[PDB]
Symmetry: D2
Subunit: 463 residues, 4 copies
């Protein structure tokens, strides 16, 4: 069934699927890089290329190096890509050249061929829009791919990751306020400790997410800087005067995000330290999220022979062999995502060290890892919020049982009956399996009413 | 346009797309874990589940707890899955429950419903093969997902990763032999050193891959052990006597690989140390491959601004105004894959620490990272071999130019004038921009005839 | 020779070296944690404990829970520790409890016993200053160790790491300015590329360090927050009202650094996300420094059969067997330090995920890794600056040779003689081993004088 | 107060502290690499250099290139170093040249000068044993430092790490046997599951350590290969015929460990893949040890707010007002050590990728991280064994309380009433806060006598 057209270059003929909008160079690149599943370059990178190619055409026309009719042809195809209509025209993998050259050429060819069809021609004829001379005007593969990487990274963080974390933080803050008067037993070293409120414990999670949000936002100004206009080595050779600033202005306009031209194009090509910087903040959030998810599943564990202090939503059967068992599966998905982010940080950091001279040629692996972390954190925070956090409720009788049976409240008695008598009560309760109150009364040291007045858990959760 | 049928599990009713062969539990997971791209659980895991479900049915029939007609129904659908016909029936993500329960239930439901249709029934009616009582007989998610992970991991390593590395090693060995008489300049600390042959340098790469292959093969016996038969917590509750050994024998038969039952089912459920062990060896290979690929692009650097001791193939047309351009495409793809494997090792090691009590619930992320490393190493080694290594050739004039002018050829004068005198010659040439021979004569330390007789790079590539 | 005194607790007698100022609890802790070399807890942590113990005594006296005479006794020993006089009194390892409990008790015992000697008593007699009741008043091991960790971390970064990076950045900036007119050949993919100046290449390194400095400084406000006053679980039980704010004020005064009380004490005890945040910025600097050091040793490689574009200081013989060889050993030390920092980041991130409930009990390993990275980056930047960067000089003849022999300048001819003639010149030069100028002249396409006018490398390093 | 003598190398004159036995090159390094704490190069590396310098002298004398009287002078100082008498003569840091050249020169200079004093001369005079011509005869830094790294690494693993892990494994095995009849509740996903014995749970830990020991031992043959004899670039230039084999034999004799000469000297200089390989196995052990230590503190959590199924020893006095306090001191030390090993693996893997051409110049950082992991695992396993594992005891009343309460004991009714009816019972008790038996009677699904006869935890810890 597969029908081909025949294209030609200095390697000879090359068959291209007859209906596909890529060209000879993209087709050869499929075979040169058969590494992992086809088409693995992230769609967000292709979308970002559409933004920057449109902006380059607009800047080039303003600066009188590209005719406006060709700008319009290019821009129309870019809009189609941005609308999600052409993803099946991008068959190339992440694991291509480290400059992402083949993906740059893939969008140049697709824009060229689709423009020809939009102009009324037949796919496979020579286009009015030349892939290199027109679509790639004033550009290099070297400066286009890192621009796409930053556009995609910034957009994912600001439009997906941050909103998702913010929503989860808001839920945990509302829960913290709802739980502010529920006194529970602390655990340090996993061992019995002095009291705090369930709201205080949840307030820690809120504060962790607030700090992670601040830290991630701190990284945005460096990520906003774009390499476009540095061309092959950073000097801007082959760009019209002012192109750097103008093309960044168009990118900022079309994306609605505050992109600027990079202050130092050599730094922008030879390294991807902004990706290292921003990914470190994603990893900081993953570190906090792991701990939050871990605590919540421990607090919900049981329902009889674990901790059992909270209830969480029960969304699906947990087991076919153990009937009625339900597991904290949203917490599990979150902790697995966090494990992924920590390893993505290893990869990004390694790749970030490995630039040589004028160019870091690890760009696709850095982009792929960054976008994966940003996306998975966003998606897991949405899922965990909607399917776990919004439904957390206290098990007030279990919490109260733990408080009443604890030996750790005994020090409330020291100022009233002295250290030695307090210790005698705790030692007797421990030996007998009884409560502090039972032994305070039955040793004749404190009346029931005086004990209730002196040992108030709600008075033990502040200075 | 979406039409649903109504199904149920022990928790309630669930609307399931009318034409899909999964059931209530798969549909819940599909909707409850919208995390990353759709349907991301690796197809290798689904295929491995098909092998183990077929084996479990065969073992259950032999041990007289499942009728053979139901075995045949189950086995038929497993065959369809293995033939690649039913991947649209597996919509679940990696980022699900950490035991992989939901993918276990996905295959149980698909086998049950497709068997009913194969039997002449209507999709949605009660099946002759119950998903839990028949397809999951003698099993838990807790022992099935680890079993699928090991089957998939072992098969990827033995059928893909090892053959690809072996082929690349063979090419580098043939190149080493072809280059055994070409004397080049060593570089240590990036600085000019003493001679070695290009074949000797390439023989190092060969040895590195041979050691990595041995180290990876050393990890196979632990990876061959299967959890299947441990059921919920490791005790084998609800298995027929002898099921653990028999089901492993059927898995070994159907896969053609030497799987055995795990000696300790608690170790097999509560941790995935075999994945840590085997991935460490994949990472060892990636460390060596990075260095090999890095050296080859450095040796090829050019045409004029660098080293230029070797030529590498061109895989793209190039341009007429850029003659002699060098495009180290495969070196870049390989080094990026290696960077990926390093971080996959961090993830696997982290997840491997995190088992609690009777179960590690990081199983899908461990399986996904392992399979990715094994696949990308295999594919990158094939591509690097075919599009780079087989075509490496020496630039003999450039090699000779760079060896003949190394100042550290003065090491050859150590035996005649002492290491201190030789240092003064090399230090003087470096300061004056002159040659070794001219300064040795200027210093009155060596004559011209003595210099030509004593300084021969071809005599410096072996022992005394 | 070893003479002991005999102390006593409920485990029985314990021999303590007769002249040492620690007590029974520290002595037992030596044996309980024989893990790695003795005394490995960083001296900076001990110094930080001295600051916080002095501040706690001052706050406690102001708030009328500790007599001023005992404050003075405690403060005097703290001053001795800060003067570096008592490090031999701290024998405990990093690998103790994860709350650092044993090091807290070690300073409490040393302060107690040294105060007694300062008061005119004999070491081994009962002290006027009780280790727990006085030196540990209003405190827990749980809130003291993380306070010491932040004090030590912040001080190391601001007093050592940042100044060292700043100095190196300044040197590289001066070199960039000095080299601004030296045109050299770019390298992308390790392969010949279009020109840039040596000053432009060095300006990339400067920009990388400037961004890393900004990123590290962004992490300081979270690191300035101190846990002290949270006590065992975060509630501040057993502190006088206002102690949290007052003790942070004293710490800020005594250290001269802008410490504040943590806004959320649960976040401050249950996690060490500020250490993750700040270490990610140290790792970002290490990623940049690796690339900078790698480029510099590649550019200096040879001196005959490598790159050879720069000279670096030659500080020592590189080899005994190869006479006169000198190696870029400062670059090697730097790259090894950077490798260390990347693994320290793995450890800190792992430990940061592992808090449970009210307390993260991975505090010493996080503190040790953080201080090691901050110290090694500082020391390597000083050494690399003084013994390499200040002495970098261009090899102008070698740089010029590479420019004159490059095929990459041929595109300067396109607008003057056309693509086809330019390509003919490049193809002929490549085939013959000659220069572009030689073939332009000898093909009769360009005169020598016209070639020099049209192909000016200094005009090819901007837009 | 500081008095110096004047020395020189091929680069110029150097002032050396008058009473120190090092020379000009050590003094340059001491002053040029003020990075981290003073004198940080591991003493195990210095000791390993003493073994290899003694072996080189013995091999050189046998092969007729060094007189036996000079061999004896060198060997005597090597013995003094091995006895621990000269560590004050080694002031250099890890963070020096990446080949470790400066530490090689440090031992050459110290041997030379101490031999002269041993011969009756004055420190600072010309020695009978030349540091380069005699002590470094047939050697380079490029082959000596990797040799020292392997000697030190292998000795630490076999003489410290393996014995410590083996002892801990034996203790856990004895505990598993002692606990084989104590039925406890399994936990999966942290949730109450079906029973297993406490001995079964501990047997998982034993199996994990056994696999880690096997994996570590599998890495020993690569680690046994020594670079010595490759000299500057791997060719063996300037070695006598047969020196590589003979010097390895002397190293094996003097250390008592089964070292051999490396099969490929280029692989042995340009990469440290054996360190990557062996460290991955140390990291595998650390991954298992983390999980074991984590479980033990979770099982001990208490006295009243947690699980409390086991007792662990107390190692500190405690306080009268805090009876029953549990202090999981060794679990914290162990888990922190394990966190350290994970990051050491990142560093070693990164450095292992970074060799260029004939030499990897990340040798000291690789050696330092490897030795730290091997040492800390050994010490932590000794401490954890002696101060925690040997004293673990069951809390049998608490264990029984927690198993009798598990709703997943309802799994035992599956064979009688079906998985769906059993689910309703457990779901009802969970909703109502009642017991399984009470709801099963209320639902009319099981009688009281049938429940007592059918539900027995002790019958659920094996197969059908």
């Amino acid at each position: 069934h597969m029908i081909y057209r025949t294209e030609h270059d200095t390697m000879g003929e090359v068959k291209v699927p007859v209906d596909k909008f890529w060209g000879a160079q993209t087709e050869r690149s499929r075979n040169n890089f058969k590494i992992g599943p086809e088409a693995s370059m992230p769609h967000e990178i292709i979308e970002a290329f559409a933004y920057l190619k449109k902006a380059a055409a607009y800047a080039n026309t303003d600066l009188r190096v590209l005719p406006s009719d060709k700008r319009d042809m290019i821009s129309q195809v870019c809009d189609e890509i941005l609308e999600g209509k052409l993803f099946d025209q991008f068959p190339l993998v992440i694991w291509q050249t480290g400059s992402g050259t083949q993906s740059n050429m893939n969008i140049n060819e697709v824009i060229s061929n689709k423009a020809h069809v939009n102009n009324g021609g037949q796919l496979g004829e020579k286009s009015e829009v030349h892939p290199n001379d027109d679509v790639n005007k004033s550009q290099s593969s070297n400066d286009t791919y890192p621009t796409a990487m930053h556009i995609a990274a910034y957009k994912k963080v600001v439009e997906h990751t941050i909103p998702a974390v913010e929503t989860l933080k808001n839920t945990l803050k509302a829960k913290s306020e709802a739980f502010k008067n529920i006194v529970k037993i602390g655990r340090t070293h996993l061992m019995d400790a002095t009291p705090l409120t369930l709201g205080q414990e949840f307030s820690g999670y809120v504060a962790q997410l607030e700090f992670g949000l601040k830290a991630l936002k701190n990284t945005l100004p460096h990520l906003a800087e774009l390499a476009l206009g540095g061309t092959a080595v950073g000097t801007g050779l082959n760009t019209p005067q002012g192109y750097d600033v103008k093309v960044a202005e168009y990118i900022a306009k079309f994306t609605g995000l505050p992109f600027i031209t990079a202050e130092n194009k050599f730094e922008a090509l030879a390294a991807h330290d902004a990706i290292v910087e921003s990914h470190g903040a994603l990893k900081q959030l993953a570190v906090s999220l792991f701990k939050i998810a871990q605590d919540i599943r421990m607090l919900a564990s049981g329902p009889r022979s674990g901790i059992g202090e909270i209830h969480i939503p029960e969304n699906e059967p947990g087991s076919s062999i153990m009937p009625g068992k339900v597991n904290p599966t949203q917490n599990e998905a979150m902790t697995m995502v966090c494990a992924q982010v920590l390893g993505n940080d290893t990869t990004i950091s390694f790749a970030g060290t490995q630039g040589n001279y004028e160019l870091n040629v690890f760009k696709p692996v850095m982009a792929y890892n960054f976008l994966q972390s940003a996306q998975l954190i966003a998606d897991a925070c949405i899922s965990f919020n909607d399917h776990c956090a919004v439904g957390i409720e206290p098990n007030e009788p279990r919490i109260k049982e733990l408080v009443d049976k604890s030996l750790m409240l005994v020090t409330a008695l020291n100022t009233h009956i002295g250290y030695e008598n307090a210790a005698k009560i705790a030692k007797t309760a421990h030996k007998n399996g009884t409560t502090l109150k039972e032994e305070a009364i039955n040793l004749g040291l404190v009346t029931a009413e005086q004990f209730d007045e002196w040992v108030k858990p709600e008075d033990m959760v502040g200075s």
